[PDB]
């Protein structure tokens, strides 16, 4: 009967990952040798979704190309996916106001403002949502969030928020952000006359996964000013600007649910999925017919991988297939794409390597992100915070400083092709 | 109380259930309390029944420095002298102080010691005379038998640790924690394995403590022992008491830890203090034990009883279905490879001689 | 005699108050009877907070009174108080209603050696005392209060005398700690919450259904703070929130000197933190300020038995009502769902329903008292019909019939 719909909002959070989104869209970059949206996808499939639409604003072809050739186009897919294009830098709401303008919302549905790594069965949340809906049609949106630590390494400033919920009916009655200049928390006491038992929570993680009802898109057209959901929308509801309607919060107390959005989030979440937190969504399950396998201390390898004898592999590190590693080289807490090649007698700590990447002998690297098919000569060295793009080769006996993002095309950043980079240039 | 009646039911509680004899009776409240009771005892009494992660050794201390205040605030009646009446006063304290939680061995032995020194002092000394030495006799008993022996053990225990070890503890033993903590400061290179178990996950607090010193630790529940034991190289154990045969008496999973270690050829080091030794002897882990209420099992999730509507919540009113949870078991010596007391690293079976090395010091 | 402090020392000492009856205007006027002497189970209100203490295991306690009432209290204490404790009474001349509860306790700063409890004359409780002390005995907090769900009145909307208005209380469920407590009128704009608080105890539940019962238990040391801090009028109003802002907001760093000085309950290991918790249950427990005196009394249905030393002629009826000693009901007059104090007299043709009668009251013939309340010594003329009305002390009303009003002596 009831068609379950769902819409993913790619590109909308393409911001921080600027140096590499120009190489390819962020929805397509690999988390743990696995592209982002797949983590979001199986989550969607886990929700029992039957119909999905994806907004695109960059490399839509490159996006749609993968999708058409993805496993989610085959008849085995639990849901039919179609792609939609619009303007670039898609601010939310403009999607919703464009959405109902196309008229395709059968009933309740979900919303994801980016790409999500999670494993929570939402099937409960729906019956938790559709129930209280069928008596109060003004039940507009159900928000789902993860109970965690207030200082939890996965709670970031974007998600660092404060909710106020009714302990009985789990209705969010007040919400605000946690910007550095918000000392006090204020709310009008009109709620107390309508609510007996309340709970103030700062231990949450705004997963930004939102169960939206049917009126929502049309409501956005009636309220064009709303552009950010968590700032313009919900605030308008609680302020009775948008009147007579109410939302609801579902706090998750088990399993995992986080959203890849910031560079401060990639490294964290990568260290989460490696720590099994998103079982069964793990490399050794090998969703896309990979050849992974678990090893102790959270070491992950694939079939047909070249390791020396003197090469030493510490913990919390994964390795894609067809990838070689030189002698007396040490890798620790890093992830590595497929087909890569590591020189001899090198130290790689907490780095992030992608597909078919080459590294020469004697190289020290830490907290670095190496894009696809980038070569680094011998005697080189990097440090914590660096970022490169595709093909941005570096010549031998070179050094890169912290947080110094690079690129292969001049547009707004620094760096060019070959050897001289920081000291000396290869094009500027 | 009901006296012989409530003292005959106990000896009627001897039937089919192999736990028919284990005294379940408790007093978690100050309701109907007698008046022969010093305040600081009551607080301590409430501490015992309500504290959960506490008292492998801290009880004996917290009991003694409480006892001082009792005798300090005590004064003998004009009729009889001091020693002729003090015990009866203290006897009325422990009787209450039992119904809150049965005595440990560390506490029971200290009591047995205190009642002695009471009976041996000379009558010439007056009250203010008689009291003052007892505190020293107590304050010495604390420093000599407990704290020093700890520092001796911690040194001797850390001695046989080797750079590269991987060592395993089980449910926060304040002694063994002091070892690993001390081990890090000396610069020993290693890492620790922490085994937790249901109900009150006494092990996570050990994880907190160790992690707050930057120790490579690993947290797995007891049912995963078969897995992690391959990694381990040494096993450290802090016991509630050691037995005259050389058996180690500690909490529930203390046996399985020693067992799989043997069948995986890793050693079982028992860090225990001398006064905890006992001339008692027992073979099965059911003759002498202490119960924890089965209601705590109803907690299905990973937290203390809170939003845990366990499907067992009515077991008290379901026939043929009764939960339980011992908190102490008896591990035989064949698994324990060594006990480390302040008398040095000794074979566990060498315990009862050490006890005899005290009755010589005491007449 | 060697009775109370021979063998075992003392743990706490209890103080109770008597604050003029402030809000209980039509009943606290005259100095003939004060607040703490208004009956409840046809027994004066002071009987209950004491019975608790006595049953809690208290040989003797301390009472704070006002000079205008030091006389009758003792007179009742010497004759009337059913209990067995001993009551040191103190009525310092410094008292003046502009100086509230804490100021009174401030004056008796010298007679406080140990930790202590603070009830009020109106701390009507049925809550088992061990649950309170054991809590304080366990967590070893710097303070401990109590709160109960607001009293459900069987009557609904008569007059909006908000009693205590509303009190918003914020606690952390597990740790029991209290983190927010302030009346409404003090903050009506936007209810502030220093977020700096949240980054510890990020889980703050808070109810609006709760009211105070004026039960408090403190470690001793605080009494010095009351001496040093003269700007503390009432315990509820000033002291409690002054403590809760110190639980966090460490910039609230008026020196915590009072902790260090020899007050160790002996090795210096408790200065790490200061705290206070709350506690609730669903039993007879609340605080009468006027409106509750009708209800808190009605809550004495537990008295499910008989009357004594009275005279109700034939052709009369009294059932489940509560009537005290010596009173008299004349022929053809009915009583229902109503209580009557000492030695009152009620003529013929009279009807008293859902109404509260104090002591020594004369009721002329053929009147009606539909859910009214009348003070001691008062007097009411014949053929009078009062509904939802109050009657002041020692007052006479003649033949009038008025509802909703509060009849009282001319008093000029």
Please spell the DSSP secondary structure of A218-239, one letter per residue.
HHHHTTTT---IIIIIHHHHHT
State which of A292, A317, A352 marks the end of a domain: A292
Alpha-carbon gap: C224 to the closest alpha carbon of chain B (Å): 23
In degrees and rounded to multiples of 5, residue C118 shows phi and psi of: -130, 100
- Contact of B303 with chain A, judged by CB distance below 8 Å, is answered with no
Chain B contacts in chain C segment 19-58 (CB below 8 A): 57
- Per-residue tokens: C153: 């009145």
- With CA atoms as reference, the chain C residue closest to B47 would be C138
b/e per residue B5-21 (b: at least 16 CB within 10 A): eeeeeeeeeeeeeeeee
Instruction: Say if residue C53 is in the same domain as residue C188.
Output: yes
Joined tokens for residue A355: 């597909």
d(CA A117, CA B30): 52
**Inter-residue contact C330 to C347 (CB < 8 Å):** yes
CB A238 within 8 A of CB A140: no
User: Is there a contact between A205 and A146 (Cβ–Cβ < 8 Å)?
Assistant: yes
Do C317 and C290 fall into the same domain? no
Residues B140 and B191 occupy one common structural domain: no
Instruction: Measure CB to CB from residue C134 to each of B30, B39, B73 and give the nearest one.
Output: B30
Count Cβ atoms below 10 Å from residue A66 Cβ, excluding itself. Answer: 19
Rg of chain A's alpha carbons, rounded to an integer? 23
Which residues touch C217 (CB under 8 Å, ≥6 apart)?
C12, C115, C116, C117, C118, C132, C133, C136, C143, C144
Comparing CB atoms, the residue among A187, A196, A199 nearest residue C191 is A187
Q: Measure CB to CB from residue C130 to each of B31, B38, B50 and give the nearest one.
A: B31
Q: Is C309 domain-assigned?
A: yes
Report H helices in A48-160: 60-69, 94-100, 123-133
Q: Are residues C294 and C342 in the same domain?
A: no
Interatomic CA distance for residues C26 and C14, integer angstroms = 30
Query: Could you tell me which chains touch chain B, where touching means 3 or more CB pairs under 8 A?
Result: A, C
Cβ distance of A192 and C208 shorter than 8 Å: yes
DSSP 8-state symbol, A327: T
Question: How far is Cα C171 from Cα A23, in angstroms, rounded to an integer?
Answer: 52
> Residue A380's closest CA among A407, A367, A362?
A362
Residue length, chain B? 363
Q: Measured between CB atoms, does C405 come within 8 Å of chain B?
A: no
- Domain with B45, as residue range(s), is 1-152
At how many Å resolution was this determined?
A: 3.5
Rounded distance between C-alpha atoms, residue A210 and residue B213, angstroms: 40
**SS3 category, A291:** coil
* DSSP, res B202: T
C162/chain A closest Cα distance in angstroms: 14
Beta strands in A315-404 (DSSP E): 318-319, 324-325, 330-332, 335-336, 341-342, 347-349, 352-353, 358-359, 364-366, 369-370, 375-376
- Residue A183: CB atoms within 10 A of its CB come to 10
Torsional sign, CA A288, A294, A300, A301:
negative
Among left, alpha and beta (phi > 0; psi -120 to 50; other), residue C54 is alpha
Evaluate whether residue C6 is within a structural domain: no
Q: Nearest-5° angle of CA A244, CA A250, CA A255?
A: 165
Query: What is the signed CA dihedral for B77, B79, B80, B81, rounded to 10 degrees?
Result: 70
Same domain (yes/no): A103, A246: yes
Bond before C271 cis per omega within 30 degrees: no
- Give me the number of domains chain A comprises: 2
Of B92, B95, B115, the residue nearest B36 (C-alpha): B92
C312 shares its domain with C291: no
The values of phi and psi at residue A213, to 5°, are: -80, -165
Assign 3-state DSSP to chain B and report helix, strand, coil percentages, each to 5.
Answer: 45, 10, 45
C370 bridge partner residues: C353, C387
Residue A116 phi/psi, 5-degree rounding, is: -120, 135
**Residues A270-298, buried b or exposed e (16+ Cβ, 10 A)?**
bbbbbeebbeebbbbeebeebebeeeeee
Same domain, B92 and B117: yes
For chain A, after which residues does the C atom lie more than 2.5 Å from the next written residue's N, i.e. where is it broken?
A: none
For residue B101, give the nearest of B39, B167, B55 by alpha carbon: B55
Nearest CA to A212 out of A90, A95, A74 is that of A95
Residue C144's alpha-carbon distances to B12, B254, C118, C222, in angstroms, are: 44, 40, 10, 12
Collapsing DSSP to helix, strand or coil, C39 comes out as: strand
Reduced to 3 states, what is the DSSP secondary structure of residue A109?
Answer: strand
Task: Give the helix/strand (H/E) hosting B96.
Answer: helix B86-99
Rounded to an integer, what distance in angstroms lies between the CA atom of residue A189 and that of residue B117?
A: 67
For residues B106 and B164, membership in a common domain is answered with no
CA-closest candidate to residue B326, choices B361, B293, B281, B360: B293
Dihedral sign (CA A132, A135, A136, A141): positive
- Are residues B39 and B130 both part of a single domain? yes
Q: Distances from the Cα of A300 to the Cαs of A285, A292, A337, in angstroms?
A: 11, 7, 12
C277 and C383 belong to one structural domain:
no
Q: Which of A259, A292, A325 is the last residue of a domain?
A: A292
Nearest to B46 among C8, C9, C137 (CB): C137
Quote the tokens at residue C336.
């229902």
A152 close contact with C: CB closer than 8 A: no
- Residue A212 CA to residue A139 CA, distance in Å, equals 9
Asked if C238 and C272 sit in the same domain, the reply is yes
Long-range contacts of C262-266 (CB under 8 A, 24+ apart): C263/C219, C263/C220, C263/C221, C265/C115, C265/C140, C265/C219
Cα angle, residue A142 at apex, residues A136 and A143 outer, rounded to 5°: 155
Segment (H or E) for C346:
strand C345-346
**How far is C141 from A280, CA to CA, in rounded Å?**
46
The CA-atom distances, in angstroms, between B258 and each of A123, B170, B193, B263, B287 are 45, 11, 14, 9, 21
Could you say which of A178, A182, A199 has the minimum Cβ distance to residue C205? Answer: A199
Tell me which residue in A182, A197, A203 faces C202 most closely, judged by beta carbons.
Answer: A203
C-alpha closest to that of B191 among B222, B208, B169? B169
C138 and B39 in contact by Cβ < 8 A? no
- Note whether C266 and C122 are same-domain residues: yes
Whether A222 and A308 map to the same domain: the answer is: no
Q: Across the interface, which of B36, B46, B306 has its CB nearest the CB of C134?
A: B46
Tell which of B33, B39, B40, B49 to mutate to test the C interface (max C CBs under 10 Å).
B39
C-alpha distances (whole Å) from A235 to each of A19, A231, B55 are 33, 6, 51
**Residue A384 near residue A367, CB atoms below 8 Å:** yes
Of the CA atoms within 13 Å of residue B298, those in its CB half-sphere come to 17
Do A173 and A233 belong together in one domain?
Answer: yes
Whether residue A58 contacts residue A21, with contact meaning beta carbons closer than 8 Å, is answered with: yes
Neighbours of B302 (CB within 10 A): 12
Contact criterion met (CB < 8 Å) for B39 and C9: yes
d(CA B197, CA B253): 8
Same domain, A85 and A42: yes
| Length of chain C (residues) | 412
Buried b (16+ CB within 10 A) or exposed e, B141-168: beeebbeebbebbbebbbeebeeebbbb
Dihedrals phi, psi of A291, to nearest 5 degrees: -115, 40
Q: How many CB atoms lie within 10 A of CB A366?
A: 19
Residue A359 DSSP SS3: strand
**DSSP symbol at A405:** B
Q: Give the CA diameter of chain C.
A: 75
DSSP 8-class letter at A148: -
Chain C positions touching B29 (Cβ under 8 A) are 130-131, 134
Residues C120, C262: contact at Cβ < 8 Å?
Answer: no
Residues B165 and B260 in one domain: yes
Using the Cβ of B263 and the Cβ atoms of chain A, whether some distance falls under 8 Å is answered with: no
> Residue A21 is encoded by which pair of tokens?
């989104």
> Which of residues B94, B124, B152 is at a domain's end?
B152
- All residues at 6 or more sequence positions from A66 whose CB lies less than 8 Å from its CB, including other chains: A28, A35
> How is the beta sheet containing C115-118 ordered, strand by strand?
C86-90, C60-64, C12-16, C115-118, C216-218, C143-144, C276-277
Does residue C5 sit within a domain? no
Asked if residue A303 and residue A276 are part of one domain, the reply reads: no
Q: Which residues contact C19 (CB under 8 A, 6 or more apart)?
A: C35, C97, C100, C101, C120, C121
Are C206 and A199 a contacting pair at CB < 8 A?
yes
- Bridge partners of residue C147, in order along the sequence: C212
Cβ partners under 8 Å of residue C140, min gap 6? B43, C219, C265, C270
Question: Is C3 among the domain residues?
Answer: no
Q: Rounded distance, CA C200 to CA C198, Å?
A: 5
Do the Cβ atoms of A371 and A388 come closer than 8 Å? yes
Question: Do A67 and A216 belong together in one domain?
Answer: yes
In the structure encoding, which two tokens stand for residue C175, read together? Answer: 């740790």
Cα of B219 to nearest chain C Cα, Å: 25
Give Cα separations from A396 to A303, A362, C295, C348 (angstroms). 31, 10, 89, 117
A188: nearest CB among C190, C202, C205: C190
Report the 10 Å Cβ neighbour count for C174.
11
Q: Where do breaks (C to N over 2.5 Å) occur in chain C, by preceding residue number? A: 265
HSE of A319 in the Cβ direction (CA atoms, 13 Å)? 26
> How crowded is residue A233: how many other Cβ atoms within 10 Å of its Cβ?
26
Residues of C in contact with B43 (CB under 8 A): 137-138, 140
Task: List chain C residues with CB under 8 Å of A184.
Answer: 192-195
> Cα(B276)–Cα(B243) distance, rounded to whole angstroms?
9
Q: Which of B27, B30, B69, B127 to mutate to test the interface with C (most CBs of C within 10 A)?
A: B30
User: Are C315 and C383 part of one and the same domain?
Assistant: yes
Count of CB atoms within 10 A of residue C148's CB?
Answer: 22
Counted domains in chain B: 2
Show residues of chain B in contact with A254, CB under 8 Å: 301
Which residue is associated with the tokens 């309607």?
Answer: A245
Return the residue of A nearest to C204 by Cα. A200
- C-alpha–C-alpha distance, residues B219 and B212, integer Å: 15
C280: nearest Cα among C115, C169, C162: C169
Tell me, yes or no, whether B157 and B146 share the same domain.
no
> Do residues A304 and A227 both lie within one domain?
no
Q: Of C303, C324, C353, which one is at a domain's C-terminal end?
A: C303
C-alpha distance from residue B314 to each of A13, B323, B324, C127, C173 (Å):
51, 11, 14, 27, 25
**What is the spatial distance between Cα B112 and Cα B278, in angstroms, rounded to a whole number?**
12
Residues B100 and B159 in one domain: no
- The answer to whether the Cβ–Cβ distance between C8 and B38 falls below 8 Å is yes
Tokens standing for B262?
Answer: 């043997």
Residues from chain B that touch A253, judged by Cβ atoms under 8 A, are 301
- Residues 6 or more apart whose CB falls under 8 angstroms from that of B185 comprise none
A135 interfacial to chain C (CB closer than 8 Å): no
Residue B64 near residue B144 (C-beta atoms within 8 A): no
DSSP output for A364-380: EEES-EE-TT-EE-TT-
Q: Can you tell me the distance from the alpha carbon of C306 to that of A159, in angstroms, rounded to the nearest whole number?
A: 66
> d(Cα C405, Cα C390) in Å, to the nearest integer?
7
| Residue B340: other Cβ atoms inside 10 A | 24
Query: Which of A253, A276, A315, A332 to probe the B interface (max B CBs under 10 A)?
Result: A253
Q: Tell me the residue range of the domain where C34 lies.
A: 11-303
Q: How many CB pairs under 8 A join A and C?
A: 69
The total number of structural domains in chain C stands at 2
DSSP per residue, B117-178:
HHHHS-TTS-HHHHHHHHHHHHHHHIIIIIIIHHHHHHHHHHHT--TTEEEEEES--HHHHH
d(CA A265, CA A267): 6
Nearest to A357 by CA among A381, A375, A377: A375
The whole domain housing A341 covers 293-428
**Alpha-carbon distances, residue A110 vs A264, A389, C153 (angstroms):** 26, 34, 46
Q: CA–CA separation, A273 vs A292, rounded Å? A: 14
């Amino acid at each position: 009967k009831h068609a379950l719909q769902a819409i993913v909002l790619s590109d909308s959070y393409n911001y921080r990952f600027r140096p590499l989104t120009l190489d390819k869209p962020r929805c397509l970059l690999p988390l743990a040798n696995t592209p982002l949206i797949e983590y979001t996808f199986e989550f969607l499939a886990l929700a029992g979704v039957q119909e999905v639409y994806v907004f695109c604003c960059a490399h839509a072809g490159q996006i749609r190309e993968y999708i058409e050739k993805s496993k989610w186009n085959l008849p085995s897919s639990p849901f039919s996916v179609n792609t939609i294009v619009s303007r670039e830098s898609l601010s939310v709401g403009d999607a919703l106001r464009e959405l109902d303008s196309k008229q395709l919302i059968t009933s309740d549905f979900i919303l994801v403002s980016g790409d999500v790594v999670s494993n929570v069965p939402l099937n409960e949340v729906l019956k938790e949502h559709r129930k209280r809906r069928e008596d109060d049609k003004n039940a507009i949106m159900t928000m789902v969030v993860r109970e965690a630590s207030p200082f939890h390494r996965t709670r970031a400033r974007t998600e660092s928020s404060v909710f106020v919920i009714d302990k009985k009916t789990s209705q969010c009655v007040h919400y605000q952000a946690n910007e550095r200049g918000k000392h006090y928390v204020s709310m009008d006491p009109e709620i107390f006359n309508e609510h007996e038992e309340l709970e103030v929570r700062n231990d949450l993680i705004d997963c930004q996964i939102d169960i939206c009802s049917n009126d929502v898109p049309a409501l956005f057209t009636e309220n064009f000013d709303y552009q950010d959901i968590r700032k313009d929308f919900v605030y308008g509801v609680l302020t009775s600007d948008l009147l007579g309607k109410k939302i609801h919060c579902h706090v998750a107390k088990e399993n995992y649910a986080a959203r890849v959005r910031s560079l401060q989030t990639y490294d964290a979440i990568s260290k989460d999925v490696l720590s099994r937190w998103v079982y069964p969504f793990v490399p050794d399950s090998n969703l896309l017919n990979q050849t992974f396998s678990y090893q102790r201390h959270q070491i992950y390898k694939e079939e047909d991988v070249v390791l020396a004898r003197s090469c030493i592999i510490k913990a919390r590190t994964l390795i894609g297939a067809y990838t070689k590693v030189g002698d007396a080289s040490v890798v620790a807490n890093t992830i590595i794409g497929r087909n890569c090649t590591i020189g001899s007698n090198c130290s790689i700590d907490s780095a992030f390597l992608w597909e078919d990447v080459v590294i020469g002998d004697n190289c020290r690297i830490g907290k670095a992100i190496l894009a696809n098919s980038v070569k680094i000569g011998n005697n080189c060295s990097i440090e914590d915070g660096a970022i490169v793009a595709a093909g941005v080769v570096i010549g031998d006996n070179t050094i890169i400083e912290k947080n110094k993002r690079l690129t292969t095309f001049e547009s707004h950043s620094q760096g060019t092709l070959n050897d001289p980079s920081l000291v000396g240039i290869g094009g500027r | 109380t009901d006296a012989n009646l409530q003292e005959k039911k106990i000896f009627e509680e001897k039937q089919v259930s192999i736990f028919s004899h284990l005294d379940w009776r408790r007093r978690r409240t100050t309701e109907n309390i007698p008046k022969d009771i010093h305040p600081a005892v009551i607080r301590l009494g409430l501490k015992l029944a309500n504290y959960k992660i506490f008292g492998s050794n801290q009880r004996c201390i917290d009991l003694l420095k409480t006892f001082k205040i009792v005798i300090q605030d005590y004064q003998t009646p004009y009729g009889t002298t001091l020693s002729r009446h003090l015990t009866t006063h203290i006897n009325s304290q422990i009787a209450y102080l039992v119904s809150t939680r049965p005595l440990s061995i560390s506490m029971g032995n200290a009591i047995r010691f205190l009642k002695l020194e009471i009976s041996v002092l000379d009558i010439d000394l007056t009250d203010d005379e008689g009291k003052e030495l007892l505190l020293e006799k107590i304050d010495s008993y604390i420093r000599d038998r407990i704290i020093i022996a700890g520092q001796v053990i911690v040194q001797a225990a850390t001695e046989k640790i080797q750079d590269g070890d991987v060592i395993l503890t089980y449910l926060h033993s304040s002694t063994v924690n002091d070892v690993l903590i001390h081990a890090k400061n000396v610069g020993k290179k290693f890492r620790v394995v922490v085994v937790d178990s249901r109900p009150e996950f006494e092990g996570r607090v050990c994880l907190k403590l160790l992690t707050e010193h930057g120790i490579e630790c690993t947290y797995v529940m007891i049912s995963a022992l078969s897995y992690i034991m391959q990694e381990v190289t040494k096993i450290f154990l802090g016991g509630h008491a050691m037995l005259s045969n050389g058996a180690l008496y500690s909490r529930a999973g203390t046996s399985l830890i020693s067992l799989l270690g043997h069948e995986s050829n890793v050693p079982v080091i028992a860090c225990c203090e001398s006064y905890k030794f006992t001339e008692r002897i027992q073979l099965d882990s059911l003759v002498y034990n202490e119960l924890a209420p089965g209601d705590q099992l109803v907690n299905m999730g990973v937290d203390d009883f809170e939003e845990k509507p366990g499907v067992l919540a009515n077991w008290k009113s379901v026939k043929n279905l009764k939960l339980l949870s011992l908190k102490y078991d008896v591990t035989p010596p064949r698994l324990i490879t060594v006990c480390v007391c302040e008398m040095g690293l000794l074979p566990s079976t060498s315990v009862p001689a050490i006890i005899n090395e005290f009755k010589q010091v005491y007449a | 005699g060697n009775i109370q402090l021979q063998s075992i020392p003392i743990e706490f000492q209890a103080v109770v108050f008597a604050g003029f009856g402030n809000s209980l205007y039509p009943l606290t006027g005259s100095d003939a009877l004060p607040k703490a002497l208004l009956p409840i189970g046809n027994k004066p209100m002071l009987h209950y907070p004491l019975y608790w203490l006595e049953a809690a295991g208290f040989t003797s306690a301390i009472l704070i009174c006002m000079e205008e009432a030091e006389a009758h209290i003792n007179a009742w204490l010497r004759s009337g108080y059913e209990g067995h404790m001993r009551i040191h009474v103190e009525a310092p001349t410094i008292l003046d209603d502009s100086k509230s509860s804490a100021d009174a306790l401030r004056a008796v700063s010298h007679l406080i050696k140990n930790d202590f409890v603070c009830l009020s004359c109106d701390s009507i409780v049925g809550l088992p005392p061990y649950t309170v002390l054991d809590k304080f005995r366990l967590d070893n907090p710097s303070a401990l209060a109590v709160y109960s769900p607001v009293l459900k009145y069987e009557h609904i909307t008569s007059q909006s005398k908000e009693i205590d208005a509303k009190q918003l209380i914020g606690i952390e469920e597990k740790t029991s700690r209290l983190l927010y407590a302030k009346s409404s009128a003090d903050v009506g704009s936007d209810f502030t919450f220093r977020m700096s608080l949240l980054w510890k105890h990020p889980r703050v539940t808070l109810n609006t259904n709760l009211s105070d019962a004026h039960i408090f238990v403190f470690k001793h040391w605080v009494i010095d703070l009351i001496r040093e801090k003269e700007s503390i009028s009432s315990i509820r109003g000033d002291l409690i929130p002054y403590l809760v802002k110190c639980q966090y907001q460490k910039s609230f760093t008026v020196r915590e000197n009072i902790q260090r000085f020899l007050s160790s309950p002996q090795e210096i290991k408790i200065n790490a933190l200061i705290a206070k918790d709350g506690i609730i249950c669903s039993r007879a427990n609340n605080l009468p300020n006027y409106f509750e005196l009708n209800k808190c009394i009605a809550k004495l249905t537990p008295e499910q038995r008989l009357v004594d030393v009275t005279v109700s002629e034939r052709a009369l009826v009294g059932a489940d009502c509560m009537v005290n000693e010596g009173t008299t009901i004349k022929d053809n007059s009915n009583i229902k769902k109503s209580i009557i104090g000492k030695n009152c007299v009620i003529g013929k043709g009279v009807v008293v329903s859902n109404s509260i009668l104090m002591d020594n009251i004369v009721v002329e013939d053929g009147v009606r008292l539909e859910s009214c309340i009348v003070a001691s010594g008062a007097q009411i003329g014949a053929k009078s019909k009062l509904r939802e009305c109050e009657i002041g002390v020692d007052h006479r009303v003649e033949a009038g019939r008025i509802a909703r009003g509060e009849r009282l002596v001319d008093m000029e």
